[PDB]
Symmetry: D2
Subunit: 353 residues, 4 copies
C-alpha cells in the first residue's frame, strides 16, 4: 500500500433509536439511501425490511440521534451540497425527506452531538479545508451558516466529544499524517489551531472514548497494520506515543467499548475475513486477532444492542448486508455466524476512498 | 442512631434537560412542587426563577428524562396515589399538569429508564411490598397496570440499570438489611426473587455504576458511617464484602462518577457541613473526607453539568436552596462557595424519613 | 472487646532460607525457642523435625534472613534483654547460640532489613518508648548502640521498607490509635517525628507493600473487624481514609501479596476458624470472607513457598502447630486441609498480649 | 537493517551487591574483565576505581548475585569454554579467580537464579543449540554437567523467572523469530518444547516481570522500532499480540520497573542519543520517547540503587564508561547529565553481534 491509500470503509452507518433499536443506512444500486431497522431491541430480532429515501446521493450517509431521540441522516447530493433527513418523531418511520443545507463538500459528512444537545456536522470543503455547520438550538431544524476551520484534508473527518464536553476533530492531512483540532470551550464556536499527531495513516481515523474519559484514536498505518494513540491527561494536547499491533488489515477499523469497559477493535484482515482484537485487561495489552468465518467486502460497522451485546455489519460477496452478534451479554460471549439482511444490494459511495 | 433510622434525604431531585441544562424539583411551604433551571448549560449560568406546578403533594418528587429528551416528574398526591407531569416538548417550560397513575403508595417514587427507552417507577405500596408501573411504549404516555414484586420495605427504593440492561432495585427490609431484586432479562417483566445483601443500613441505599459496568451501592450503616458494596462479576448475584469508611455522616450520601471515571461521594458530616470523599485511583482507596464551609440542613443532591463540572445542591439554614460547583472541568478543580437560588423555601416531603 | 485489647498473635515467626525453604520458630512448654524447616522448598515437602535452641526466653521470637542468606532470630531473655542467634552459614543447621544485645525490652522484637543490607531491630523499651539497634555493616555481627525514638507504645511494633528504601515503623500509642515514624533518608539514622494515623486499633498493626510501592496497614479495630489504610502518594505523610471490612475477627490479621500482585488477608474469625479475604481485582474491592474447616487457637502466620504457593500456620487445639497450603501456583488454587507438624507443643510468649 | 541484525549490546553487566551497592563488569582493551563499584549504596557515591580480573576473555561477562549475597561472573575464555569467578565473601573485593566450567560456547553467557537459590547458566553451544548448567546446591561451587535443550539460536539467550518459580528462556531462532522454552516445574530440570512467539526481532530479547507477575519481552523489530509482548494469564503459553512503538532505535533496549511499578525502557535512538519511554499509567500506554543529551556508543545498561533511583550506564565516544541517574526517588525525578567512570576504556566483546 501507498501512504495516500484509504482503507475500505464501512458500507453502512448505524444508530440506536430512542428505544435502542438498531437502524442501518446505506446506498443502493439506485444511488439512493435506504434503511432498515430492528423491530425490537435485541440482536435476534426481526428486521423491518429495506425502506427507501427518495433522492440520488453521492456520499456515504451519516446518522446521529438527536437529543430528543429523533434520528437524522446527512449525505451529499448530486449538487455536491449537504442534505439532511430526520424522523419527525422518535422511534417512527415517518421522515422529513431530504432538506438542503447547501455548501460544497468533498468528503462524507461526519456528525457529532455537542454536550449542549446541538448536532454539528464536519466535512471537507471544495477548498479541501474542514468546514462545519451546527444546529443553533438543540434538536431543532434551525442551523448555523457554514464556517471554515481551515486545514488541508486527505481523509474523511472523524469527531468525538472529550470528557469535558469539547468536540475534537481528526483528519489526515496533506503529509498523510493524522492531524486534529478542537473546541477550546465546551459546545462553543471557539477552536484551537490544527496540530499534528505525527504518524502517517492509510485509513480514516476512528475515535472512541475510554472509560476514564481519554480519547483513543485508531487507524491503519503505512505498513498496513492497526495503530493507535491515546490522550494521557485531561487536555487535547498531551498524547501517548503511537503503537502498532501486528497483523495486516485491509479495511478501516471499527472500535467499540464492551460491557466491562474494555476496548475491542474489528477490521477486515489480510485474508479478507473479519478480525477482532480486544484489550485483555484495563488499558491493554491487546489480544491476538481472532477471525470469523467468511470473506467480507467492506470494513465492519460495529454497534451495541440495548442489552450490551455487540453486533457487526459487513458487505458480503453477494453485495448484500450481513451481520453477526454476541449471543449473550458477556465479554466472552460466543458469536453467531453471518446472517443476511436481504432485499437490496449496496455500493460504496464514500467520497474519499 | 437506631438501626431503623433513615438519614436526612436530599431536598431536591435534579435532572439534565435534553440540552444538559440542570433543573431542580422540590416541595415548598405551600406543599406544591416547584422547579427552577439553568438558562444555559453550565454551573455559572443564570437560573430562570422558581416556577410552580399547581397541586398539593405528599412526597419528595422524582424526575427523569425520557428517551425523547422530555423531563417527567413523579410524586404522591393527597390521595396517596402516584401522579406525573411532563414537558410537552424537550427543553421547554410547557408542562402537562399533574396526571393520575393511581395506586396507593407509601414511599417516594423512584423512576428509572429501561434500556429500551421505557420509564419505570418503583414504590412501596400500602401493603409495604415493592410495586412498579411502566411505560408500555418508550417515551409515550401509555402506562402499564400496577404490579407487585412483593417484599417488605422500610426505606425508599433505589433503582439502576446493570450494564447488560437489567434493572435492579435496592431497598431496606424489615430486618433493616439491604435487600435487592432484579430483571432477569433486559427491559422485560421477568424478575428474580428478593435476596439479602446482609448489612443493616440507616439511610436509603444509593446506587451508581462504575466505569467497568459494575454496580456500587452506598448507604449509611448502623454506626453512622458510610459503607459500600459492589458487584464483582457480570451478574446480579456475586458481590464484594461490605466496607465502611471512617467518619460519622448525618445525611444520605450522594454519589457521582467524575470526569476521570472515579467515584466521589458527598454527605453531610458529623459537624453538619458538607463532606466529600473520592477514589484516589482506579477502584480506591478512598480519600479522607474534605469539608466545605457552611452548615447544611439536608443531604446533598449532586449533578453534572454539560462540561462535566460537578454541582451540589443543599438546603440552607434559611430553608432555601443553595449550590456550589467546580470552577473547571478537572478532577482536582477548585470549588465555589455556597450560593443562593432564591425565591421560595423548601420542606422535606420525603415519605419515609 | 476493650479498646486496649490486643488480638491473639501468631504462634510462630517464619522465614524463607536462602534456598527459599520455609523455617518456623516458636516457644515450647520448656520456654525455649524451637524451630523446624522444610527439607526441600515446596509446601508438600517433609519437614526436618523440631530442633531446640538452648535457653529460656520471655517473648515471641522474630526471624529475618540476612542479606547474605543467613537466618537470624531475635528474642527477649529472662534478663529482659535482647538476644540473637544466627545460622553460621546459609541453608545450614549450625547456629551461633544465643548472643547478647543487652537493653531492656517490653515488647516482642521486630526485625527489618534496610535497603543497604543491614538488619535493624525495633522494640518497646522499659520506658515504653520505641528503641532500635542495627547492624553497622551488612550481614555482619557488628551492632550499633541502642537508641531511642521516643513515643509511648501500647502494641508490639511493626516495621517495613517504603519503596524508596526508608524504614517506617507502626505501633499503637497511649490513646490506642495507630501511630508511625519513619527514616527520612533511606537506610540512614535520620528519623521523622511521630505522627498519628487516627484510628483506634485492637491488634498489633500488620504492614505490607502493594505492587505499586505503597504501604498498606491492617489491624483489628474497636468493633473487632478488620480495618486498613494505605499510602496514596510517594511519601510517608499522605494516606487514605481508614476502611473497615465486615466480619468479626478474633486474632491478629496476616497479610500476603499473591502471585498476581493482589493482597490477601487471613485472620481467625468469630467462629474461631481461619478466615481468608482477597482483593477481587487491582486495588480491591475485598471478597467476602471464606472459612477453612477447623477451630484454631492463634492468629495465622502466612508464608510463600519457592513456587509462590501460600502456606498458613496456626496453633491447634492440641497446642501443636498445624499448616495448610495451596495445591497449585494460582490465585484460585484449591487448598489442603490442616496437617500436623508434630513433636512439640507451643505457648504464646508474646510480651504484649 | 537486515532481519538477521543484532542491535548494539550494552557494554557492561551490572549487579547489586548484598548491600545494594552497584558493581559493573566489562571487557577492556587488554581483553580482560575489569570491574568497579560504588563505595556506598547511592547514585552520587564515589566509585572504587577499576580493578582487573587476570585472564583473557572472549565474550561479554554476565554477573548475578548468589542467594548468599556473593557476586559471581561468567564469561567465555580463549578456549571458548565457560569460566566463572566469585566473591569469596559478600560485599568484599576478594575473588576466586577464574575457574572452569568447560563446555563450548558461541554466545554470551546468561545467568539466572532459580527460585530454590541455585544459579543456572544458558548459552548457545557449538552446535547452535541452547545448553545449560546449574549449581546443584544453592550458592555453592558445586555444578551439574552440561545439558542440551536443543533448538537453533541466532541471538544471545535471555532468561527470567515466572511468578510461579519456573525459569523461561527466550532467544531468536533460525527464522529470526523470537522463540522460548520453559521449566514446567519450578526449579526443576523438566522443560517444555520450544515454541515460537512469531515475530522477527533484530536484537537480543530483553525480559522483565511486571507487578502482577506477568513476563514482558522487549526487542527491536524488523523496522528498527521497539516492540513488546506480554503474558496474559498465569501460564507460559498464552501471550498478547505484539505491539510496536514508534521511534527508530539503534541499540538493544533495557527495561526496568520503576518505584511505582510501571515499566520504563531505555534505548539508543536514531540520533544516537539515549532515549527513554515509560508507561504513563498501569499497563500503558507508553509515553513519547524523551532524549538525554549526548551521543552514545552502546546500548544503555540500567540499574536501580538502594533507594530506588534509576541509574544508566553507556559507552561514550571516548570509549569510556559514563553514567547518569535520578536525583530523587520519584517516578518524575529530574536526572543528572552524563558523568565519567574513568580509568580504563572498554570494548564490545559480545559474541553474537
Ligand atoms: Ca426537538
Ligand atoms: Ca453552547
Ligand atoms: Ca415521545
Ligand atoms: Ca423490552
Ligand atoms: Ca556476612
Ligand atoms: Ca546506609
Ligand atoms: Ca554459600
Ligand atoms: Ca529444585
Ligand atoms: Cl461524531
Ligand atoms: Cl433509577
Ligand atoms: Cl520488618
Ligand atoms: Cl536471568
Ligand atoms: Hg461524535
Ligand atoms: Hg489498570
Ligand atoms: Hg435508574
Ligand atoms: Hg486498577
Ligand atoms: Hg521489614
Ligand atoms: Hg533471570
Amino acid at each position: 500500500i501507498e501512504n495516500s491509500a484509504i482503507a475500505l470503509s464501512g458500507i453502512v452507518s448505524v444508530a440506536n433509536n430512542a428505544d435502542n433499536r438498531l437502524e442501518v443506512f446505506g446506498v443502493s444500486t439506485d444511488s439512493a439511501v435506504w434503511h432498515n431497522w430492528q423491530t425490537a431491541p435485541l440482536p435476534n430480532s426481526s428486521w423491518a425490511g429495506w425502506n427507501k429515501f427518495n433522492g440520488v446521493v453521492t456520499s456515504k450517509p451519516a446518522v446521529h440521534r438527536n437529543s430528543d431521540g429523533r434520528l437524522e441522516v446527512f449525505v451529499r447530493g448530486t449538487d455536491n451540497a449537504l442534505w439532511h433527513n430526520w424522523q419527525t418523531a422518535a422511534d417512527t418511520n415517518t421522515w422529513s425527506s431530504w432538506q438542503p443545507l447547501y455548501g460544497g463538500i468533498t468528503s462524507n459528512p461526519e456528525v457529532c452531538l455537542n454536550s449542549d444537545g446541538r448536532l454539528e456536522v464536519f466535512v471537507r470543503g471544495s477548498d479541501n479545508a474542514l468546514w462545519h455547520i451546527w444546529q443553533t438550538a438543540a434538536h431543532t431544524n434551525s442551523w448555523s451558516n457554514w464556517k471554515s476551520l481551515g486545514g488541508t484534508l486527505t481523509s474523511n473527518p472523524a469527531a468525538h466529544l472529550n470528557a469535558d464536553g469539547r468536540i475534537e476533530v481528526f483528519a489526515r492531512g496533506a503529509d498523510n499524517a493524522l492531524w486534529h483540532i478542537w473546541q477550546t470551550a465546551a459546545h462553543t464556536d471557539q477552536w484551537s489551531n490544527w496540530q499534528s499527531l505525527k504518524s502517517v495513516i492509510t485509513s480514516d481515523p476512528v475515535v472512541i472514548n475510554n472509560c476514564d474519559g481519554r480519547l483513543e484514536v485508531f487507524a491503519r498505518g503505512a505498513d498496513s497494520t492497526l495503530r493507535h494513540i491515546s490522550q494521557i491527561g485531561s487536555d487535547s494536547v498531551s498524547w501517548s506515543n503511537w503503537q502498532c499491533l501486528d497483523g495486516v488489515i485491509t479495511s478501516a477499523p471499527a472500535a467499540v467499548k464492551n460491557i466491562s469497559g474494555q476496548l475491542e477493535v474489528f477490521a477486515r484482515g489480510a485474508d479478507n475475513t473479519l478480525w477482532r482484537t480486544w484489550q485483555t485487561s484495563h488499558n491493554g495489552p491487546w489480544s491476538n486477532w481472532s477471525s470469523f468465518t467468511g470473506i467480507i467486502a467492506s470494513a465492519p460497522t460495529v454497534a451495541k444492542n440495548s442489552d450490551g451485546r455487540i453486533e457487526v455489519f459487513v458487505l458480503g460477496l453477494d453485495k448484500a448486508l450481513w451481520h453477526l452478534w454476541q449471543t449473550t451479554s458477556s465479554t466472552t460471549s460466543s458469536w453467531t455466524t453471518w446472517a443476511l439482511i436481504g432485499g437490496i444490494t449496496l455500493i460504496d459511495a464514500s467520497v474519499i476512498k
